[PDB]
Structures are given as structure tokens and as C-alpha cells.
Amino acid sequence: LMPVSWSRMPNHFLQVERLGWAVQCQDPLTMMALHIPEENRC
Amino acid sequence: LLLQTNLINYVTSIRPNIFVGRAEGSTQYGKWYFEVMVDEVVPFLTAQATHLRVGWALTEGYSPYPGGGEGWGGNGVGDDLYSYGFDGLHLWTGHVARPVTSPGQHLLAPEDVVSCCLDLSVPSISFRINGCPVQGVFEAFNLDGLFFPVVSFSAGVKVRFLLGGRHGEFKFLPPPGYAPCHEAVLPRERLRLEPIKEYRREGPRGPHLVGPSRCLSHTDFVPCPVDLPPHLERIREKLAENIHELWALTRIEQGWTYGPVRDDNKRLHPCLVNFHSLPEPERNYNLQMSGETLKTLLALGCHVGMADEKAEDNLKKTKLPKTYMMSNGYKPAPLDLSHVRLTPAQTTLVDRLAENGHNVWARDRVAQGWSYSARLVPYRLLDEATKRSNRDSLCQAVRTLLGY
Amino acid sequence: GVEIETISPGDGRTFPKKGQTCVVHYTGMLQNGKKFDSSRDRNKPFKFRIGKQEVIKGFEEGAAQMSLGQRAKLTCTPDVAYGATGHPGVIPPNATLIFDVELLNLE
Amino acid sequence: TPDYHQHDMNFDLSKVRAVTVTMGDEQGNVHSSLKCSNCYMVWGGDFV
């Protein structure tokens, strides 16, 4: 075990008081992924 | 054998500033309660379903990591052993889900309420649908840090988040004995919503790269009180009376001239006389907590030695501000412990002694069932106002240095 | 044996009858969690006629028990859907099939 | 199991994640008691 890796930084994030202190989120976003099945990361 | 691939959407988690934990010391009650409001109608926007979950997670999550994950993508709450959550039809712990039973049997839908539970003696977590219990409880924990109210959402979500007395209008009545969770806040700032483990934030120039932040721990949230020459025990009342001079100083400004009936509200005081004229528990009231303080002062590591002896009486009092005189004849007059500008260590030694006083009283309050309910936190974690009075009050007692 | 577990509630009065079309925007999965079919990646809903043996036996005995606008989760046993030889290249032989069917319109 | 990432030099068997899941009926009588752990080991010091 080594406590380090090298992960990439996505170019676009999810972007985003009154009664209830609501959260704000409108736009969707997705990404492509791999599923090497031996130990199962993604 | 091969390397399969597919498309995964994104998810993010949000938690409040509150921090609850159980340890030897100030641990509140271990009984907390909150609800939430959901009004989202987008089940299949952009192919896959819209992930929505709520629950608890301990303070070693590090889950967010926007992007890749373990099962499929950088998922949210419930897919680990450091977070416990609910979706509406399943319980998630360790990335594996099990169905639940309830009247209605539908996952989170718009215009709905879910109620969570916390009880750290059994310790176990239960959940409650809008008006009915959810038949399932987590048990056998390993509580070592603190806990987050965590929420999970994919996209296109405008959930309102309910807290309580601040503004959260509790639709339903909490079960018997549960703090509304607004009381537990860091008493040094306000409360707000922030994303956990954020490492990029927006700004006027744009992106801002931020490194790891700081956090408390179980040991930190626990007050801990600190562990003969003739002149040390010879002064006693001489320092006590010098301290007792100030006992009326601003109580003249309060207008409390020796109230014989202890007027707690109509501005009078019953212990505003000389030591012998004082009631029975009034001599050690200003000496026992001071004599032990001087006795403990050797353990403080200070470099002090009573060797001034400047005529042994040059410490002159300051008096005569108009009448200023009572029925007792005290006419309070603090001595000449004014021209003592202390030492760099004494600037902190007085504070260190003040920290001990707050901690010692905290242990006394904790002994009686945490002050027996009905509001003081550990030293260096408490508010700013309390940090002001305790310095000046102990300073006058400490200003006797280089005087005796 | 088809185990119909509901996910979202529906109308509860309109059910499919014989000789009638249905549109179903399904997405099928295996027991292990690997997806083998989806009809929403294509953005074209699957339409089938009930009773004329177009779909497998587990799909139509699964779609007949639901209502209009209801979304349920089936667990089709391997006896009723691709028992011995299976479908080559997609589904392994003797595998359990899971379907998240949703009936959009017309019974 | 693969979802185990405890890298510490002070590890003892008390420092193992283990979560007990129990479910019951509406009557409250239980119906299963499952324990998921991210680690299934023994101690070699428990024999010698």
C-alpha cells in the first residue's frame, strides 16, 4: 500500500439563504469511465 | 477479462457546519433530529436516474473526489463504511443496498419529508418517512470522530434543507428528547452550507486552488482541568482584600450598595462587606480558589518569588471618588498593583491560569450532569466575550507580583 | 416466476389487454449489476404488441401486471427467459435478467 | 474485500470497520442481523 496516486482534474464542475436555505443546481454533467473488473475501481 | 466502459453522471455532497460527537467531556445529549424538503420532478433527465440520498457520515469521508470512484464513478453517500444513508427504498452501507419496508413504498418524490434519528448510547441510526417509521436500524458502530448531516444529488435539484429554531419550521414533533441541532454550532462564527473536501472554488479572477483544511477531533472537544514558604500562605487575605476591592468597583456603577435581601433583579447585593462581616462561605470563596491557584501556580512553571518588600506597605490604594461609601464603611480602594507590566510569559501565564479556571469550572459544571441542563464550552474553543472578562478578573489577583 | 417490485406509483386503473400496443422505455440489467440493454441511450422507446409473442415470456407477463405511468423492477428467472443456449454475445447462459420497465403511454 | 483503505501504523483488530445491519417487521421483532466488515482476519498472537 502507498497513500498516493495521480488523479485528473475535470475541466467542468457542477457550478452551484431564503426560507429553508435551499440549494441551487440546474445543469447536468457526465463523464466516461472504465470498470477494470479484477478489483473494481472505476 | 477485458476492460468494459460506459458513461457515468456526476454527484456532489453538501453538509452544514454543525459537528456532533461523543466523548468524555462536553458531549451534549446524543439525541438529534432534523427533516428536509424535496420538490424535484426530474427522474430520468440525461438518461440515468437522479441520485438523491440523505444520512450521516463521520469525519474521515474524503468521498467527494469528483470523477472516478469505486463501483461506478465518484458516487455519493452510502457506498462505503464511513457514511450511512437512505434513498427511499434502500439502505446503503459498503456500496451494497438492501430493500426496506414502509407504508407507501416509493422512493424520494416531490413534496415529501424524511426524518433521521441519532442516539449515541445504543448508538444506532433510525429513519422516519413523512409520518411513519422506517423498519430498519443500523447498529454496531465504531464512533471515534464526529458526524455530518450529508445529502446527495445528481443535477437539477433545488432541495430545501430543514434545521429548526433558526428558521426550520418543523412540520412534525420530535420524539421525546432530541435537540433541534441549531444549538450545536461553533461559538465563534455563523452557520452556512459548504461542500466537503472542496479543492477548487470560484472567484473574481476565477478558479482558486485550496489545499486541505483543518478539523476538530474527539479529544479536542473535551475540557481538561489542569493537574511551603511562609509568605505564600501569609498574604492570603492581603491579596484577597486587594481582589475584594474590585468586588464593589463596578458594582458601584451597578448601584448595589450592600443589599440586605440579595436583590438579584432590583440592583442590590448581599456580600458587599468586610470578610468577617461577610457570611460563612465568603472567606474561602476568595481564598480557597486562590490559595489552590497559588499552590498550583508552582505547577504552572512560572518564575515567581516573593522578594519585593518595598517598605512592605508602599502598595497604596486609590479611593475618594465622591461619596462612594456604604453602610459597611468599605469604600472600595484597589491597591497599587497598577504599575506592573508583567512579562512575555506572564501575558500567557495569566491566560494559561485563566484557561485552567475555565476548565476547572467546566469539570464542576460537568459533574452535576453537565450543569443539569436548565452553556459553556472548553477553553480556547469558547466565545470571544468570555475570553475578555476572565483576563481582567484574574489579572488583578496576578498583579500582586513584585508587590509582596 | 416474475417478481414485480414497484419503484414509482402509477395510475392503477389502466392495464394492457390483448391485441393492444404498448410503449415501454425499459433498461435491462443482469444479476451482477452489469447493464446489457437500455432503450434510453438510443432515445427511442420500445414498442411491442401483447400476446403475439414478440418479446420473451418474462417481459409480457411482466408488462401485463402494471398500470399506465407505473415504473417497476422485474427479476426474470432464467427458466422463462433464455434458458439453455441464451443469446450469443450479450447474455451468458443460465443468467438472471433484471428489467426496470416503465410504461409511458397507451395502456 | 476491495473497499478497504486503512493505511495506519497503529493498526489493531479494534481498528477494523464493522457495521451491523438489522431489519425487522412493523411489530419490531427482528428479521435478520447482517454484519458487513471490510476485513476478515485473525490475530496470530491469539495462538502463540
Curated annotation (Swiss-Prot), chain C:
SUPFAM superfamilies: FKBP-like
InterPro entries to which the protein is assigned, alphabetical: FKBP-type_PPIase (IPR050689), PPIase_dom_sf (IPR046357), PPIase_FKBP_dom (IPR001179)
Keywords associated with the record: Cytoplasm, Isomerase, Rotamase, Sarcoplasmic reticulum
Reactions performed catalytically: [protein]-peptidylproline (omega=180) = [protein]-peptidylproline (omega=0)
Superkingdom assignment: Eukaryota
Pfam families, per database record: FKBP_C
GO BP terms: 'de novo' protein folding; calcium-mediated signaling; insulin secretion involved in cellular response to glucose stimulus; negative regulation of calcium-mediated signaling; negative regulation of heart rate; negative regulation of insulin secretion involved in cellular response to glucose stimulus; negative regulation of release of sequestered calcium ion into cytosol; neuronal action potential propagation
EC identifiers of the protein: 5.2.1.8
Domain PPIase FKBP-type per the UniProt entry, residue ranges: 19-107
Top EC group: isomerase
Function: Has the potential to contribute to the immunosuppressive and toxic effects of FK506 and rapamycin. PPIases accelerate the folding of proteins. It catalyzes the cis-trans isomerization of proline imidic peptide bonds in oligopeptides.
Family as reported in the entry's similarity comment: Belongs to the FKBP-type PPIase family. FKBP1 subfamily.
Subunit structure: Identified in a complex composed of RYR2, FKBP1B, PKA catalytic subunit, PRKAR2A, AKAP6, and the protein phosphatases PP2A and PP1. Interacts directly with RYR2.
UniProt name for this protein: Peptidyl-prolyl cis-trans isomerase FKBP1B
Organism listed in the record: Homo sapiens (Human)
From Swiss-Prot, chain D:
UniProt remark on domains: The calcium release channel activity resides in the C-terminal region while the remaining part of the protein constitutes the 'foot' structure spanning the junctional gap between the sarcoplasmic reticulum (SR) and the T-tubule. Pore opening is mediated via the cytoplasmic calcium-binding domains that mediate a small rotation of the channel-forming transmembrane regions that then leads to channel opening.
Superkingdom of the source species: Eukaryota
Subcellular location, record wording: Sarcoplasmic reticulum membrane
Gene: RYR1
Name of the protein: Ryanodine receptor 1
Role: Cytosolic calcium-activated calcium channel that mediates the release of Ca(2+) from the sarcoplasmic reticulum into the cytosol and thereby plays a key role in triggering muscle contraction following depolarization of T-tubules. Repeated very high-level exercise increases the open probability of the channel and leads to Ca(2+) leaking into the cytoplasm. Can also mediate the release of Ca(2+) from intracellular stores in neurons, and may thereby promote prolonged Ca(2+) signaling in the brain. Required for normal embryonic development of muscle fibers and skeletal muscle.
Coiled-coil ranges (or none): none
Lineage, top ranks: Eukaryota, Metazoa, Chordata, Craniata, Vertebrata
Tissues expressing the protein: Detected in skeletal muscle (at protein level). Fast- or slow-twitch skeletal muscle.
Assigned protein family: Belongs to the ryanodine receptor (TC 1.A.3.1) family. RYR1 subfamily.
